[PDB]
Amino acid sequence: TGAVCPGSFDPVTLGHVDIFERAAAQFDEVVVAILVNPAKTGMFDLDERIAMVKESTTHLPNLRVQVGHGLVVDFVRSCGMTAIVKGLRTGTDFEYELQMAQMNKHIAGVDTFFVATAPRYSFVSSSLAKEVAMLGGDVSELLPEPVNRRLRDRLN
Amino acid sequence: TGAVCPGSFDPVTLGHVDIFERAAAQFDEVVVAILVNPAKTGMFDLDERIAMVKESTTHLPNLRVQVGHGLVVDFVRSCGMTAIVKGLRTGTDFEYELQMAQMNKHIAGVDTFFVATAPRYSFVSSSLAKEVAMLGGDVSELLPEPVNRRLRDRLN
Amino acid sequence: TGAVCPGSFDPVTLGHVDIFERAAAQFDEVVVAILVNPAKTGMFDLDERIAMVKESTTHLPNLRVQVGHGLVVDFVRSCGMTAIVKGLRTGTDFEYELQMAQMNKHIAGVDTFFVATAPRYSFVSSSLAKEVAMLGGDVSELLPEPVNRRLRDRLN
Amino acid sequence: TGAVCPGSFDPVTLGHVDIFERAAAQFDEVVVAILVNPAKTGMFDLDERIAMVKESTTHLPNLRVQVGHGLVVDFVRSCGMTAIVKGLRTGTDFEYELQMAQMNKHIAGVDTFFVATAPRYSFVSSSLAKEVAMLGGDVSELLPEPVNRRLRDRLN
């Protein structure tokens, strides 16, 4: 059994890591698929994002990180899998997630499972973490130390 | 007696046709108003979008297709109509549709009727259809043949 | 063309009346379907509800009032119609309404159209009006005069 | 790798079966936990519900059926599992599901996965099916044949 946990992960948050953990506890293997967007965004480049995920997940031996591009469903079936795990947090556009799940099931037969991230991590997102951190707000309890490290470096 | 069905229809989907059919069965006449957003393009020029809607609606003799300009409620009242029919699907920004429905009532006395599109077409949207076609996946069952016909050429 | 406006109207409100007025301007005729339900303890008896509805709708000559038993889709087709018109107000269980709409389309081909109630009557409900009224609060500007007359009577 | 699909299943529908199938494809073992309520009693007794589920899942050899009592999380941990799979349909009380998911994680470490049932099955529920069938409506495409058989008997 396997699941893919896709995202842009710019940077990975403890909400993500909470979801990676739950997928890794319930599936034999987990792949974190880093899907970079077209926009010249965002903050960290591709090796940094990988680095940040790897460093935050060394305690999950059945999880690995891969760069994706193209349809999530093409990548998923690439890994020889048929399931996606996605975290739900406050502000998640769940309707659009649901639309995409129904499209992905229809076009490739892939299932999407949704899981509510833990209350304490339920209000971080990559974008909101970046905004707040770069304005001198303290988000450090909500991101992994490998992320807090590069955030602080960026601050200068 | 008459209803307008506005949209960018870039391109028209079978979700839209579903709604056209409900509009056309329940009102004496229907006007599909194509309103081109100055921002974007889009993928299909005005003429194509007209042709696609026409060709997908020959089975509805009481429906006609018009290029809309300016304030939507202004277009509606210039057609002599006071009704708008709008489809609801998975991922519809319903809170916003409600706001516009209220604004439109207030400014011009135009009523908005909301209808849930059929479940099999509930996850298609023009943009998701495009993204997926762009990326290789198959959305032909969710789009009318005049569209698929023009989609697979506009991918060569 | 034709629409049915179903409900228990216990009692009818100016929210309902707004919806009625809007179905009536838009469809050739409207039937208000009063649904007796075995047996949600009601406040007013069947003919009181008929009466209040009738007395509050004297201004709409293409509207008439009937009792419905069983399936709303049976009642609708009984009237030679194929459309239902439902108001949306604050607190509407829209997800439930959507479920029933989809089921109703599937089992009988009947369309459900939803309309946003006028903002000033967006917060009335038969339930809340009853609860507030029976505790001596002033809901009179939210109900038709015929209903207000009956309400003061119960209050005694 | 195991998941519990809990519910009252009075009767099981094809939306449920869609969920069972997906659970069964993604986990090594699945337990359908039939959880009754010390209220009323529903439509079918425990044997009928067990039987209906069994007869509808003969094609999922890694799924078994069991009566449950008490906290869902106690039963889950009884099965040696730490996961729950639950379907989403229109209109699932999703916010209440989420509350329960968070409570369940907190008191027992149990994860809940939500997955959207197929569009064609997304408007059935046990309640609505029973309501519609007993009033003479055709829900047979939405329920397994072992369920349809028994409904037909009730319609006697």
Next chain:
Amino acid sequence: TGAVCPGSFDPVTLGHVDIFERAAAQFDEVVVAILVNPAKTGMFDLDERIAMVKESTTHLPNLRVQVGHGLVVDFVRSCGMTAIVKGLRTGTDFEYELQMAQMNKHIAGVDTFFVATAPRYSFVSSSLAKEVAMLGGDVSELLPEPVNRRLRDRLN
């Protein structure tokens, strides 16, 4: 400047106390209104409910506890106040709370301010806390100690 926080508080939770603290910080005075509906029954009589709120709010010198009677806004105005403070949690019927807020403004000029309860207390509710306790589970970290204390004496 005063606010009322109304409820059945059967029993008071730390979700509630979180909300009291916020009302007590932002308003000079704060009346906790305990309203026991006729169908009150119930895991705690009025006296115990009062005691529990009293004992859980000694750290809030500007809050006091009273029995509410009748129209919620009648009671509010009788306290000389025109503000209600209502807590939001996962599972809150927010659409109905909105309806009531607007009815409340309309009838009595009472404003309702909604506040999100802290994430750690965002999934507790009086009935869930009882249900779980009743079935053996541990919710002691989500209830204040005067509640936990009296909760064990049900369980004997």
Next chain:
Amino acid sequence: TGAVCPGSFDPVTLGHVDIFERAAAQFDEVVVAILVNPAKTGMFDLDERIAMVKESTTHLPNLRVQVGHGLVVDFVRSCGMTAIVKGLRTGTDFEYELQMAQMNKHIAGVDTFFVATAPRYSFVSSSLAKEVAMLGGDVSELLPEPVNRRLRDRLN
């Protein structure tokens, strides 16, 4: 006691004014925080927005207007306050608002209270007002006369 009502107020609406009036009746003072935005195009320059807010608030002596930069919670604490009051109208992205509320509480101890805008102004927004007005529509009943004054001029 004190609250901050933040926004880009481009331009201020009677929806805003209603919220201002309500915070001012309930807190000792209110500060309107006009937030600079380096992205979002925008229509009126900072001084016009201040002016329009000032001129539409002459009747609330305990309200004043300031420009904010950076974190809302920094602005709030800057004013010696710990409370933010936001309006809810139809179309508000409440989920996003709730995410920020939780984030703001966590990084700074600041509370966010939400209050439902009056029904008559429940469908104006700066964006929709601007879009309607610049296409020749009549939104004058939904904005303060000082704004209607400036909007006429732009309509040129």
